Enzyme design. Structure first.
Site, short mmCIF file in Angstrom:
data_model
loop_
_atom_site.label_atom_id
_atom_site.label_comp_id
_atom_site.label_asym_id
_atom_site.label_seq_id
_atom_site.Cartn_x
_atom_site.Cartn_y
_atom_site.Cartn_z
N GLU A 168 0.71 -1.13 -0.02
CA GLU A 168 0.05 0.01 -0.02
C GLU A 168 0.93 1.31 0.25
OE1 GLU A 168 -4.06 -1.85 1.82
OE2 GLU A 168 -3.10 -0.46 2.97
N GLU A 309 -5.39 -7.94 -1.51
CA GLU A 309 -6.11 -7.78 -0.53
C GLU A 309 -7.43 -7.37 -1.06
OE1 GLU A 309 -4.76 -5.27 2.69
OE2 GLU A 309 -2.71 -5.79 2.68
#
Length: 377
Positions: A168, A309
Site C-alpha cells: 500500500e 487484499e
C-alpha cells in the site's frame, strides 16, 4: 535461472510454475489468504496464543486455499528478533526460535501442503504502513538491501512465488498537494523519489538479480498524477495500493513475464466511499469502478492481475452493505476470470474487516467463506 529447479513466470496474463529440468509447465491459480503478524510488534503471525501453528495451516488447506500472503517488517526478518504472544504449550516446537526461524518453519510446512507463499514487505517499522518505501531513518538503499537479503534466504524455498515489493503505497495529504509535497507515493508525476512506478523498477531489478525465478508483485498507489486521476469520475477514490489507473501510460519498466500487478480493493467496512451509496448506483455501479481503477490492467492490457487484499466483516458487526459488496465483487471476479487473490484476512483481529476466522480463532464465518468458496469453485 533457479536455485530450486522451479521457475515462476507470467504467460499471457496467467501465472505458470515451470520445472526447468523436465520442461513441464502448469498454470496455477492462487486461492489465497493473508495471515498477518510478522509485520507487527508481535513479530509472529497472530493467533498462536490460541492455536497451534501447524493446525492453522491444516485448517487453511482444509478450506481449499493454496496460497498465503505473508506480511513482514524489517525487524522480523533479522536474526535474533523475539516473537511475543505465543502459547508454548500449544506450540512446543516453537520454543527457542526467533521470528525468522518461525517464518522459515511456516513456509516449509506450507510448501509440504502444496501452498504457495507470497512475501509482502508490509511495513518498514513494525507499527504502521508508511506511505513511501523509505523513512527519515531508513533509506531506499536500506529497503533494497533488506529485499536482497530476504530474496537470498527465501529464494531457496520452492513454494515462495515472489515479492510483493511494498504494501500500500499511498498518500498522507490531499491532492493536488499530495502530488508534489514529497510525503506520499505518486505514479507518473516524474519525481523518481516519489513515483512508485520508478521505484518498483529499481527494487524489482535488484530482487531479480538474486531470485531470477521469482515474480515481482507491484501494488497501485492511492493517487498517481493529476492528469490520470482527473481522467475518471472516481479517480480520487481508489484505495491505498489500489490505484492502477497509471499503468496504461506509465507502465512499470520490468519484463512482462516477471511482473504481476496487485491492486487492493475494499468495501464499506474500510471506508464509506461515496459510490457505496445507492444514491450513486450501488452496487451495479461497481464493475465500472473496478474496471477503471485496476480491472482493465488485465481485461484490456493483458497483464497478470492478482488481487492482493480484499475483505470486510460481511455483515458481522459492520456495515451490512458489505455482504452485497463482497457478493458483487466475487460475481465480477468470476465473470471476468480474476481467479488469483489473497483474502484479508485469515486472522479475526483486523479492526475494520474481521477475517475468515471468528474471534475465537477456531470457528469460521460460514457465510463469508461460502461466498469466497464460489471463486474457488
Amino acid at each position: 535461472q533457479t536455485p530450486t529447479g522451479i521457475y515462476y513466470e507470467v504467460r499471457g496474463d496467467t501465472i505458470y510454475m515451470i520445472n526447468v529440468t523436465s520442461g513441464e509447465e502448469t498454470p496455477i491459480h492462487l486461492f489465497g489468504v493473508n495471515w498477518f503478524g510478522f509485520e507487527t510488534p508481535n513479530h509472529v503471525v497472530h493467533g498462536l496464543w490460541k492455536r497451534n501453528w501447524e493446525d492453522m495451516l491444516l485448517q487453511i488447506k482444509s478450506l481449499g486455499f493454496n496460497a498465503i500472503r505473508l506480511p513482514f517488517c524489517t525487524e522480523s526478518v533479522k536474526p535474533g528478533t523475539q516473537p511475543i504472544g505465543i502459547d508454548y504449550s500449544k506450540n512446543p516446537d516453537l520454543r527457542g526460535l526467533d521470528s525468522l526461524q518461525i517464518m522459515e518453519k511456516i513456509i516449509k510446512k506450507a510448501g509440504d501442503l502444496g501452498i504457495f507463499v507470497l512475501l509482502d514487505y508490509h511495513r518498514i517499522g513494525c507499527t504502521h504502513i508508511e506511505p513511501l518505501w523509505y523513512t527519515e531513518d531508513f533509506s531506499e538503499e536500506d529497503f533494497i538491501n533488506t529485499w536482497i537479503e530476504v530474496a537470498k534466504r527465501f529464494g531457496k524455498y520452492w513454494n515462495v512465488i515472489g515479492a510483493d515489493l511494498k504494501n500500500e503505497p499511498h498518500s498522507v495529504t490531499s491532492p493536488p498537494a499530495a502530488y508534489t509535497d514529497g510525503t506520499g507515493a505518486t505514479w507518473g508525476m516524474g519525481n523518481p523519489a516519489t513515483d512508485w512506478n520508478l521505484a518498483a523498477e529499481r527494487i524489482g531489478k535488484a530482487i531479480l538479480k538474486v531470485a531470477p525465478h521469482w515474480l515481482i508483485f507491484v501494488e497501485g498507489t492511492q493517487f498517481t498524477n493529476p492528469k490520470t486521476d482527473s481522467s475518471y469520475k472516481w479517480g480520487y477514490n481508489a484505495w491505498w495500493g489500489g490505484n492502477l489507473m497509471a499503468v496504461k501510460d506509465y507502465p512499470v519498466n520490468l519484463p512482462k513475464n516477471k511482473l504481476v500487478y496487485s491492486p487492493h480493493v475494499y468495501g464499506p467496512d474500510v471506508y464509506n466511499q461515496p459510490y457505496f451509496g445507492p444514491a450513486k448506483g450501488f452496487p451495479d455501479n461497481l464493475p465500472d469502478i473496478w474496471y477503471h481503477h485496476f480491472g482493465y490492467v488485465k481485461l484490456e492490457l493483458g497483464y497478470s492481475v492478482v488481487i492482493g487484499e480484499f475483505g470486510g466483516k460481511y455483515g458481522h458487526g459492520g456495515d451490512p452493505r458489505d455482504v452485497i459488496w463482497q457478493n458483487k465483487l466475487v460475481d465480477w471476479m468470476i465473470e471476468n476470470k480474476f481467479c488469483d487473490f489473497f483474502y484479508w484476512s485469515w486472522n479475526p483481529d483486523s479492526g475494520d474487516t474481521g477475517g475468515i476466522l471468528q474471534d475465537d480463532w477456531t470457528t469460521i464465518w460460514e457465510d463469508k467463506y461460502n461466498n469466497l468458496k464460489r471463486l474457488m469453485d
